[PDB]
Amino acid sequence: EWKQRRIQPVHILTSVSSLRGTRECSVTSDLDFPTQVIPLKTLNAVASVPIMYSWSPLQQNFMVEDFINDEIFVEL
Amino acid sequence: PPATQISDLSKRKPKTEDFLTFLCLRGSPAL
Amino acid sequence: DKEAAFDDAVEERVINEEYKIWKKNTPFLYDLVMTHALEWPSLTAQWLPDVTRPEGKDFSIHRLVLGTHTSDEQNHLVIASVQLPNDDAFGSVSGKIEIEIKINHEGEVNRARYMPQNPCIIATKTPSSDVLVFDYTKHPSK
Amino acid sequence: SLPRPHDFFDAQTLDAIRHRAICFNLSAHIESLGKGHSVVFHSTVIAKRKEKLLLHWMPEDILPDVWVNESERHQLKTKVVHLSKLPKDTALLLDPNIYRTMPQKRLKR
Amino acid sequence: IFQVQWSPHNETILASSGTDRRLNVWDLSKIGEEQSPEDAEDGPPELLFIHGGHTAKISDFSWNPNEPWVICSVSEDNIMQVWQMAENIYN
Amino acid sequence: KLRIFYQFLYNNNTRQQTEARDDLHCPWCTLNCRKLYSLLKHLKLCHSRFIFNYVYHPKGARIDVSINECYDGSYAGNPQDIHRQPGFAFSRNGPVKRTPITHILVCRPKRTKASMSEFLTYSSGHNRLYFHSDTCLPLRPQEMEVDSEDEKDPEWLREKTITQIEEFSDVNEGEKEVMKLWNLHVMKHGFIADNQMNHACMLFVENYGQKIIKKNLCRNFMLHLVSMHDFNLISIMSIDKAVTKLREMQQK
Amino acid sequence: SKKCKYSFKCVNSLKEDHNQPLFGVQFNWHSKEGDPLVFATVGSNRVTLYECHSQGEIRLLQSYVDADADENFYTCAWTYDSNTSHPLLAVAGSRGIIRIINPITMQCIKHYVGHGNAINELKFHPRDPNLLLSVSKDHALRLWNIQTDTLVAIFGGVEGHRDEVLSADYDLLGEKIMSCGMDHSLKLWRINSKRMMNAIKESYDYNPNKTNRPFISQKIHFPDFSTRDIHRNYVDCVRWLGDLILSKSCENAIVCWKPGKMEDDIDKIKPSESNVTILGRFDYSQCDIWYMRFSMDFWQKMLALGNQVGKLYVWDLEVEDPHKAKCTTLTHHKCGAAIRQTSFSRDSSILIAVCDDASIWRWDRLR
Amino acid sequence: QADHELFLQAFEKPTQIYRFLRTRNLI
Amino acid sequence: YLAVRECDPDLCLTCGAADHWDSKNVSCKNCSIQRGSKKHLLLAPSDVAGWGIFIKDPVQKNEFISEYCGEIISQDEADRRGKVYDKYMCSFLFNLNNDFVVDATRKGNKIRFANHSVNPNCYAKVMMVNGDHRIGIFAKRAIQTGEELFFDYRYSQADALKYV
Ligand SMILES: [Zn+2]
Ligand SMILES: [Zn+2]
């Protein structure tokens, strides 16, 4: 199933023409290799919701009340 | 004497090549 | 253009900030400033001449001829009652911009110019090629 | 305390505004040479009128070219003009978000 | 400028509105009279008041004949605002 | 003269004491506020993202400036767009339905005289965005006037009742089926009154008669009716009427 | 006594600037043959993309950040928009905000907020690329249809988890969902039911403008299987080994077990089945700190798990009785942090381990 | 110190917003 | 009503509790808990903290809003649940009798999203409806459209200061 479809590759993050003062992210390789710096793009903010845990709907109350030598011995 | 408010704001909003140097390029941070 | 969309987003943010700043200075710019969010956008607005001044009440009632602009629902010809603080002193009088009448209107209303010689008849411009002259008195309130 | 109201600008709009402000400071010198409330335009001689001289300022499509004498050109090689005095026809070009019709769209009237 | 309506309680007062999302009040009797540099910076002497309470384009606006200086302006943001300019502006 | 000093403060531990180069001028707006009262009020109102606690200075005025901790500057438009997916939020392409709300910002201000002593709302309707109790997703106004989304018998309760009844060891299969059907019927209708229980039995054969006939558990159903009569409620006449209605279903 | 089958060598070692611990790594298994091996990393408020080349030349292709809030990304998951074949990265954590980033346009395509706590794992349906499963700390596991931006189903309720759902996994064919939680339980929700087909089809065929009523999200309150006797502690990560189950706890071991008795078919198992038979346990050392998920290659030939000290274990699953053998332990004197997660390329040639010191490590199979 | 950078950014966000507003409002 | 009791449908026949069982708008008003006729609540982020229940339509003074449903537990089990719930500093526990406590944590109604306030807009009355104690939420004063619902939590067995 995976053998079908096209699939596209990704590119490098160029300097944002809409953000000259954009921040830069630097990744340094310990095993030689040159340090790379890329423009740190900023994700748009998404409005969050207050943290609540899961619960079940309800309309009436709901009462809550709160050697292994047997087969081996027989075979032996 | 202790810097100026407009120049301080100009040392705040831009902090890049177009910072006009001047006293902003001097020891503005940490007084 | 993607740059156009980014500029539109930045402009929306700036518009929000400017509106917040203006609302911060609303007391120092206006005497009465009442903002009401209609259910549907209105393409027209014209105060009816009739004004009711209830005795002993610090407000007065005026009639507004508002249209409706629905994306796909049924458009209407809203007539709403607005309470104004009169001359001296309202603090809390519950509903102040509640509607009064609503007549079914085919397509969004473009104009709501009432007949001046008899404010009973109110005209409306339909999106079609025909212009409709309503009569809120004859039509049911609901 | 009261919940944080999730300020609308966020960081993308702030970053775009920062880029626009840096460009404005580098181009019009609003902060440095404009005293924080003016745009500094640097004129350049283009044509000479032998009967004055025509000068075009560094921010293009902002102020129309004018005719001035050689001594006048030397005196006013650089013009500093308040934003309130900018021509309203072309003042919007100083920044894309100075005023943009938010519902560009179509239809409407 | 999509809508212009002369004030009914005054003869030399006119308000304009449109896609600019602003409603501006013009005092025709104030046209051409000299203004201070601060007044010049704020705007033309003819301009009396700029209403910046709408986020979208003003679809329509109107004055209430039963009140002196109150205006109802409806925008495409489904927002209807009934506002009266401060008395200090027009004495 | 009138030297004006700004003291920017963050967490009261880091300070940046400045001095306005242009006296009686807004450092941000670059506006000429000719009076110190006007300057302070403009700073407090227009530049509301900061707080300005005037403190006075022996030489001039010392204005302490701090970032406004609360500053409720959220989206002031339709609350729906605050949660629409990117590409559709703040679309402004067409009309959008929204719950009506009425605001009064200025009604009749007192218009008192200017004084430095000053430097020592009403809303009607729905004024927020509501969320579904089940999915925790934003609630559109089109789904507001109806669908209270809290009804008598939740699906999980019905499934739990069926599982509990079928989880018994000392019970017949058809008896379990009729017990589960009766429990589901009771939960669906929510009977709380003994007299209604009588009519309840009839409603049973009006809703589960075909199911019982197909399941061929009529004898178990009449056994349940007999047990109910033994528990009081219902009656011999009720039993006869229910059975006759059940027989009429088979003949139909 | 066989010394396993796969030998790896460390060919590269990166380091993110933010220095905060990075939690998840996911290779883009949907990339075509010959396409450069792109993998994503999540940690702190920043999500970074990289491209793997020869000799360990890891190129930082892209990077994103959410500085408007205090988001701490916990997991990443790769997909693709079948309409345009653009690879898509789904990220979430801390805030409970699901962001479907589009690296082609470098923009957050979609945002999803329905969860009441931090999301700890994101997985995609193997058959359907638009079905995103999110296991969050709100005792619930949700199913989103990112194609139509709908909540397909919520997998918590009366019989659901009583604590955080730490991780979840799909079946190889994508039919049964296994979820490991902080309540010591591993409930087996079944997406094979006709109810699941109805929900998925309705979500695909849901248009918000057509009807005023919202989409009726299914509430699967009752799992099709549940157990608590496998691990004496909570279960960090779970994974489907075909019809078997692999789970890991604080017990310094990953056990391979199967629902029911030894002859009990997984598909033909009643929800009330209270018996579980374990097959074998992969024993490692020094992995007591929780939330260190393991990973297996696409072919499930081998699986690898990180360690808190810095070691990296990989076991060969082709070997008869995989509970036996001694695995391959990959170590490095410069790797002293805790490997939060590992990932294998579609061809199991590159094994990449992300440490708790924001240091990415690349291992290549010597073969 | 990092506290100085945090304070500078926390004041730079509203300062940048208000400076853009000052530039825009005069037009 | 004088005995803090809902009208039993089998006994009270003149007051209208028994009549119009299938219909709504019962003549009697001390029967809302039994009949389950609750006001339409709405869920939104509270203006005080966390989530909060908001009322869709205006409610008069001393009018039924909803029942504080939940899982019936004993006092010892309530103590254990409180010890468990102290981790996240939000307790839904609600005293019902001397041996029964209603816990709306794992299961409950939308009325569970009510925030404590020293000037509450609602109050709770535990009435024996048809032989079972049930907690009812009534409007302390007149309530306008979209107003957030508050009720003082000092009546709950769990201390307000213990959690929040
Ligand atoms: Zn009674
Ligand atoms: Zn009664």
Residue numbers in the entry:
A (entry chain A): 59 to 124, 165 to 174
B (entry chain E): 139 to 169
C (entry chain D): 3 to 91, 108 to 160
D (entry chain F): 182 to 232, 238 to 295
E (entry chain D): 320 to 410
F (entry chain B): 425 to 544, 556 to 687
G (entry chain C): 75 to 441
H (entry chain B): 80 to 106
What did the authors write?
Polycomb repressive complex 2 (PRC2) silences genes through trimethylation of histone H3K27. PRC2 consists of four core protein components: EZH2 (catalytic subunit), EED [binds histone H3 tri-methylated at lysine 27 (H3K27me3)], SUZ12 (provides a platform), and RBAP48 (7). Associating cofactors define two PRC2 subclasses, of which PRC2.2, containing AEBP2 and JARID2, is the subject of this study. PRC2 associates with numerous precursor messenger RNAs (pre-mRNAs) and long noncoding RNAs (lncRNAs) with a binding preference for G-quadruplex RNA.
In this work, we present a 3.3-Å-resolution cryo–electron microscopy structure of PRC2 bound to a G-quadruplex RNA. The G4 RNA is not nestled into the surface of the protein, as is typically seen for RNA-protein complexes, but instead appears to be separated from the protein. The RNA density is in closest proximity to the EZH2 SANT2 domain (residues 353 to 362), EZH2 CXC domain (residue R532), EZH2 SET domain (residue N697), the RRM (RNA recognition motif)–like domain of SUZ12, and an unstructured region of RBAP48 (residues 92 to 107). The distance between the two PRC2 protomers is reduced from 51 to 48 Å on the side with stronger G4 density (bottom), which not only explains the imperfect symmetry, but also supports the model of a single G4 being sufficient for PRC2 dimerization. The disparate functions of the CXC domain in these different PRC2 structures are seen by the superposition of our density map onto the nucleosome-bound PRC2, which shows clashes with both the DNA and the H3 tail. The RNA-induced dimer simultaneously inactivates two PRC2 complexes (no H3 tail binding) and evicts them from local chromatin (no nucleosome DNA binding).
